[PDB]
């Protein structure tokens, strides 16, 4: 019996949840949490892929405008580093995962290992977020890796 679980992912719209885009499997390995995606409908390329603090994917208000998945808050960051440094650096947000790789047909199938995370309990009650932009694992030149807008989200557990 592997320590494994799934998370439903939905489109993040200004008014709430859009279509189900599929799932992501989260599995404990000898090397940390393996995120095996099973998603469809995404823009080909590499997308910011992070655990955000709050167990919500609902939109929020910012400067009078509807902001998709804003209720998830920022990146999971129990060490209070206040810095986005990616999946391989202990000095930044614990919620920083490797970029989500999206195939030419808009599907995501390629597994990504986040070695800093060791058990399922560490992802429960957080939002699994997929951004429009990519992620260079830095706050420079763009904040939070350049992920920009939130466009897909799933509350884990």
Which segments within 2-140 are labelled E, that is strand? 4-13, 16-29, 32-39, 45-47, 49-52, 60-62, 65-67, 100-102, 112-114, 127-131
50 is in an annotated binding site: yes
Q: Name the minimum Å distance from CB 66 to a copy of itself.
A: 31
Within residues 71-100, the interface with Zn ion by CB under 5 A covers: 75, 84, 93, 96
Exposure of 114 by Cβ count < 10 A (0-12 exposed, 13-18 middle, 19+ buried)?
Answer: buried
Within residues 109-138, the interface with a copy of itself by CB under 8 A covers: 110-111, 113, 115-116
Distances (CA, A) of 97 to 117, 122, 153: 9, 13, 14
In the list 48, 98, 133, 145, the residue contacting a copy of itself (rule: CB under 8 A) is 98
Distances (CA, A) of 123 to 13, 25, 134: 23, 12, 21
CB under 8 A: which stretch of 44-52, 58-66, 75-83, 143-151 binds a copy of itself? 44-52
Q: By C-alpha distance, which of 106, 119, 115 is closest to 11?
A: 106
Count residues binding a copy of itself (CB under 8 A). Answer: 22
Distance CA 95, CA 40 (A): 23
Q: Name the minimum Å distance from CB 113 to a copy of itself.
A: 6
Q: Does 78 engage in binding with a copy of itself (CB under 8 A)?
A: no
In the list 30, 63, 80, 141, the residue contacting a copy of itself (rule: CB under 8 A) is 30
In the list 32, 60, 73, 148, the residue contacting a copy of itself (rule: CB under 8 A) is 32
Determine the distance from the C-alpha atom of residue 56 to the mean position of all C-alpha atoms in its chain, rounded to a whole number. 12
Partner interacting with residue 110 (select from a copy of itself, Zn ion, none; CB below 5-8 Å by kind): a copy of itself
Which residues are documented as binding site for Zn(2+)? 1, 50, 52, 75, 84, 93, 96, 126, 131, 140
């Amino acid at each position: 019996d592997k320590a494994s679980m799934t998370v439903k992912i939905n489109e993040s719209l200004p008014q709430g949840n859009g279509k189900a885009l599929g799932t992501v499997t989260v599995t404990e390995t000898a090397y940390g949490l393996l995120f095996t995606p099973h998603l469809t409908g995404l823009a080909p390329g590499i997308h910011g892929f992070h655990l955000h603090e709050k167990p919500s994917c609902a939109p929020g208000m910012k400067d009078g405008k509807a902001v998709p998945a804003l209720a998830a808050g920022g990146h999971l960051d129990p060490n209070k580093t206040g810095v986005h440094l990616g999946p391989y650096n202990d000095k930044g947000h614990l919620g920083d995962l490797p970029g989500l790789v999206v195939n030419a047909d808009g599907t995501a199938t390629y597994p990504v290992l986040a070695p800093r995370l060791k058990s399922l309990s560490e992802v429960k009650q957080h939002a699994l977020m997929i951004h429009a932009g990519g992620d260079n694992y830095s706050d420079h030149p763009m904040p939070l890796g350049g992920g920009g807008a939130r466009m897909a989200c799933g509350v884990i557990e």
